[PDB]
A paper describes a structure:
Specifically, the nucleotide bound state of Ran results in conformational changes in two surface loops of the protein, termed switch I and switch II, which in turn mediates its ability to dissociate importin:cargo complexes in the GTP-bound form. This is achieved through the asymmetric distribution of Ran regulatory proteins across the nuclear envelope, which modulate the nucleotide bound state of Ran; Ran guanidine exchange factor (RCC1/[name]), predominately localised to the nucleus, maintains Ran in a GTP bound form that binds IMPs with high affinity and dissociates the complex upon nuclear entry; whilst RanGTPase activating protein (RanGAP), cytoplasmically located, maintains Ran in a GDP bound conformation. Here, using x-ray crystallography, we elucidate the binding interface between IMPα and the [name] region of [name], and provide a structural comparison to other known IMPα:[name] cargo interaction interfaces.
Using amino acid substitutions, the [name] was shown to be bipartite, consisting of residues KR4, a 12-residue spacer, and RAKKMSK23. Recombinant IMPαΔIBB (IMPα lacking the N-terminal IBB domain, thus preventing autoinhibition of the [name] binding site), consisting of 10 consecutive ARM repeat domains, was first purified by affinity and size exclusion chromatography, then applied to a column loaded with purified GST-tagged [name] [name]. Residues 6–15 of [name] could not be discerned from the electron density, a common observation for bipartite NLSs with long linker regions and these residues were omitted from the final model. The interaction between IMPα and the [name] [name] is made through an extensive array of contacts involving residues contained with ARM repeats 2 through 7, utilising both the major and minor [name] binding sites of IMPα to contact Prp20NLSRAKKMSK23 and the canonical Prp20NLSKR4 motif, respectively, and exhibiting a total of 1,091 Å2 buried surface area. This results in hydrogen-bonding interactions between the Prp20NLSAla18, and the side chains of Trp231 and Arg238 of IMPαΔIBB.
Author numbering:
A (entry chain B): 3 to 5, 16 to 25
B (entry chain A): 72 to 497
The structure:
């Protein structure tokens, strides 16, 4: 057997 | 009034001794930090403002400055690691955890968001957020009879922040934090908002990206059927993490892999393996390769679901990385399959696209393919039909390709090929 969501987000509005 | 202040005006207001002047200046900072092009995070850090923002989070008597300071700090914490660290080093973590209990929803939500940014920096901050006691009050915000009564934006934020507590590796999150979060996550995964679903899938994908004991903690909660259902969703931002989680699960034991099969996953593969998004096709094929590394009764289910022709298809034409996953899937199938299963594979037309791939300049795919060919010959030996296969390989250009590879630079390649020629083509 062999082994995309943003990490951080700024608030703009 | 608070549009486009300079940093020095912000500072002047923040150091006034006047809470309303301080509020105004904080909101001016929040608006600077909110703009799309090049928010001046470093300038605000260098003006020394983080400690003041952090003390404003504690002003229970002035809810708007709590909100503006929380928003300012959330946007500082959203930047590089060094920027997130300046927020943490100001003492923000405990102060945000205390605001989770605020009676003002928009404040509580801001604190959720900030903690998600902190935890999202990496393992160390994630674990520090956890040590400071963030998980109990985050989960208490979702302790309601019906998640549908929460504001949609607020639920989505909570879900994303929880997903960041589930994130990373080296190390993975503390086992006991994962145990504590999982029941809430299982509940979010049955919710009907597409972004909550996506982020819950992402969380489950992180928690299954690990050794078997990590996978097990997820599979034991019974989520595999729901993940299979999401696998079939029309929204790509759901299918992507659902497929990553399913893939991760099938890197575990053969019994974990069986749960995926039992829940009906294989029926979605004709569409995944033809999906117009090349990343889905690639991960779908990777996932197949780990299922074809299982037992013979598992290989048989791949066969019964009509998936061998779809593997011949992706081997024949797909993005190169997907083709490389397909080659793996075939070498795994041929290494564990019965004679009959291996014969079926040839009858589906595997040989010609396998041979076409030998002219790829990737020496890994070449070894994989040679191993597959050697395995298929091994099954033909047993039926006494090595000749019929030799001819089939010669007729589609495959003998020429293997001849050449005797003269290939890599050692296993020239060896493996020399062998096949010596053994089957002399």
């Amino acid at each position: 057997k062999r082994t995309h969501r943003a990490k951080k987000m700024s608030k703009t509005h | 009034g608070t549009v486009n202040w300079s940093v020095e005006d912000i500072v002047k207001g923040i150091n006034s001794n006047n809470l309303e002047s301080q509020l105004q200046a904080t909101q001016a900072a929040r608006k600077l930090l909110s703009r799309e092009k090049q928010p001046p995070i470093d300038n605000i850090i260098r003006a020394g403002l983080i400690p003041k923002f952090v003390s404003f989070l504690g002003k229970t008597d002035c809810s708007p400055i709590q909100f503006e300071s929380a928003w300012a700090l959330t946007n500082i914490a959203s930047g590089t690691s060094e920027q997130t660290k300046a927020v943490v080093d100001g003492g923000a973590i405990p102060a945000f955890i205390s605001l989770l209990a605020s009676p003002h929803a928009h404040i509580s939500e801001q604190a959720v968001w900030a903690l998600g940014n902190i935890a999202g920096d990496g393992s160390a901050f994630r674990d520090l957020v956890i040590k400071h006691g963030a998980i109990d009050p985050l989960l208490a915000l979702l302790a309601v009879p019906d998640l549908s009564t929460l504001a949609c934006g607020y639920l989505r934020n909570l879900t994303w922040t929880l997903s960041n507590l589930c994130r990373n590796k080296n190390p993975a999150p503390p086992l006991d934090a994962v145990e504590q979060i999982l029941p809430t996550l299982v509940r979010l995964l049955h919710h009907n908002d597409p972004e909550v679903l996506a982020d819950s899938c992402w969380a489950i994908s992180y928690l299954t990206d690990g050794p078997n004991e990590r996978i097990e903690m997820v599979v034991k909660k019974g989520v595999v059927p729901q993940l299979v259902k999401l696998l079939g969703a029309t929204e790509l931002p759901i299918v992507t993490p659902a497929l990553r989680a399913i893939g991760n699960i099938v890197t575990g034991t053969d019994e974990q892999t069986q749960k995926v099969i039992d829940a009906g996953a294989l029926a979605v593969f004709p569409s995944l393996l033809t999906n117009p998004k090349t990343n889905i096709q690639k991960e779908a094929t990777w996932t197949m390769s780990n299922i074809t590394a299982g037992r013979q009764d598992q290989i048989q289910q791949v066969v019964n679901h009509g998936l061998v022709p779809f593997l011949v298809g992706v081997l024949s034409k797909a993005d190169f990385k997907t083709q490389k996953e397909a080659a793996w899937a075939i070498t795994n199938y041929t290494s564990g399959g019965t004679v009959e299963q291996i014969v079926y594979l040839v009858h589906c037309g595997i040989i010609e696209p396998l041979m076409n791939l030998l002219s790829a300049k990737d020496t890994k795919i070449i070894q994989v393919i040679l191993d597959a060919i050697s395995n298929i010959f091994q099954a033909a030996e047993k039926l006494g039909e090595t000749e019929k296969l030799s001819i089939m390989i010669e007729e589609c250009g495959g003998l020429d390709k293997i001849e050449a590879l005797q003269r290939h630079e890599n050692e296993s390649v020239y060896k493996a090929s020399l062998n096949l020629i010596e053994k089957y083509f002399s």
